[PDB]
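Final report, results section. Input specification for complex C-07:
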Amino acid sequence: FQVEQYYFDVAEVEAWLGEQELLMMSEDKGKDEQSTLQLLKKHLQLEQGVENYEESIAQLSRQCRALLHPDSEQISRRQSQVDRLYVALKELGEERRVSLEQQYWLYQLSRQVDELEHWIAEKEVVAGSPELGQDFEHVSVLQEKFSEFASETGTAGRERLAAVNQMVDELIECGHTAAATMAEWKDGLNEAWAELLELMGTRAQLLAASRELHKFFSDARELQGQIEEKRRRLPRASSMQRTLRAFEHDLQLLVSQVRQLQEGAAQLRTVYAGEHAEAIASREQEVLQGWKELLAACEDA
Amino acid sequence: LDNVALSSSPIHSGFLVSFMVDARGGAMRGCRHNGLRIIIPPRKCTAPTRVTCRLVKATMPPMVEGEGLASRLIEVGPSGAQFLGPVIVEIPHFAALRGKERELVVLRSENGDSWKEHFCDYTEDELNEILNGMDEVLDSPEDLEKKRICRIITRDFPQYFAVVSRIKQDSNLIGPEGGVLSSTVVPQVQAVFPEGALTKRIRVGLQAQPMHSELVKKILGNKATFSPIVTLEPRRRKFHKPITMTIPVPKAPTLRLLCSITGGTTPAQWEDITGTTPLTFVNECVSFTTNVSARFWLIDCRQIQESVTFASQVYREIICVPYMAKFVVFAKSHDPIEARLRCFCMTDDKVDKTLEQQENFAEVARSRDVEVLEGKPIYVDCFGNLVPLTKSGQHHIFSFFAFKENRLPLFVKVRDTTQEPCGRLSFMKEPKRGLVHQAICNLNITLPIYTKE
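Structure output:
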């Protein structure tokens, strides 16, 4: 009778609820990021469908209310069962929504960590380079260009690091199951980045130390060259007087250059030893010898 | 003194993994791990170079039974670095040296696949000279053994270093002529090499590991009494003549002899050779001869038939390498009645885990360094104003390995709300029912106040 038709409606609703449950319990989380995205969309549509079904369950509520009294002992229990069962399906919806989100985040966070790790690696290789220059001008170029790299990477990497660390801080705050692993992941990046910042410091230091040595091995070649100019004095009159005055002024110039070069050379002895020290006081001996002969000739004048 | 900074005087600084040095000389301590320090002297470096000294956390150095690393592998560079004078590298370690029972050895690998012992040839005068003009101070040997700091002196650099805990070994070259090789730890332990037992000259070594009655008596009681374990390091080698071993008897037929001829990393297997080999008792010691270099051991067990099993019961335990580690306990309160509790046993591990700080966990207890034994399990129980959930089921435990993580998750509920929520946490080697035997460490605690989130 009337109860039979009502049972039919409850049966249809119960079947729909089970059909949704069974589709929502599926264990497939995804492969690539898009697969888990598409599944999160799908399950969102299922959740919206479940919410939309509220009116359909409402129709049962009205029918049961207008039926409840031939035998309502079974009727009340059966409908109340639908009430709690539907509530349970909704909670399970929140569960599987959450686990699909957390799966997606594990997928993306892993992509970013691996990408940043490879990114530090690329920078690290360019920071731990051993090239130091064949000539002073070239080492100067590397020093300036690397300094630019130090600043650009120095600030560039910070944004990426802050993004990954915050992404971890959040996913740990959420309560992600893999949070323990994530913590080490962050510790791995934070130390590695710090080392790069330290490495680029040492490398920059190395370049500076190289520049001064090249500077000495610039002047040694350059100043000794001006020594040959002294030979001009041996062959060489108002015009001659003017040239001689200019020449004497040039000698005054020279004195400052040689004094600055010798003082510069002193630092290398402090910073170098053995073969290198010996080669420094070596070239610092050759130039000084030129100083002695040139000064003696000038004294003769 | 009020003297202008020279700017040509050693550099005092700290580093993470690498730093810059010049012939000026430098002292580079490390912030990450206390006691890690590099001391390059002045004028002992040819040119400005980037030095590296990072703990690798390559191929593991071969280790026989009874040996384990004292510290994580040390990586230093440049790999081919050469210095005019010796330089100092100091690494902290965790191996429990047990007085003079154990010692440390240093290994080095140039390429990372082959390891060789590291020995340095220098003058007694050089040791004072090594500091040169530096103002640094060097800790005395006892003050180094106390801080568990190992000091490697090296005149060149290799790709890797390793500090390895082992049983004290006495080594001395011996050739055809003959020789004697006695023990420092146990003077009565001794080995004699007759005239013509070896062809070439080899550096023979001898270990003696004495017994501790607490462990032996605990595992066997009065069932048997042992002597030290005497080991001849060039194992699996037949001698062209017979060696004469001397070993003091086990303090109490009734006396059996056990020997293990295994070599390399193979776990040892004990057999009894009392019948085959004659035993001579002089001055409370036993002297026998042997044509092979093996392990040896004496037993005064009443049950001769089971004697070998008794050795296996003891050996299995006492080979485990002893590490001095810290116990740290973290906790968060689920509510006032209950709480969550994470426990760790650490050596080189992070002083303060980031995860616990992020999850708002709190350090509630922290033991001084204590001897735990590598590879053996740990039992945890709480005995004070709170207790840990358990039932008619298996307990919870964690295993200690060195330089791995050692975590034990726990849940604890306050037993009674009458008094403050303080407790007692004990880590043991065996579950607590009889007389309780010394635990591994004891930490008291006090559950932190509930956080509302």
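Chain B has three domains: 11-167, 169-319, 322-446. The longest strand of chain B covers residues 82-92. This concludes the modelling results for the funded period.
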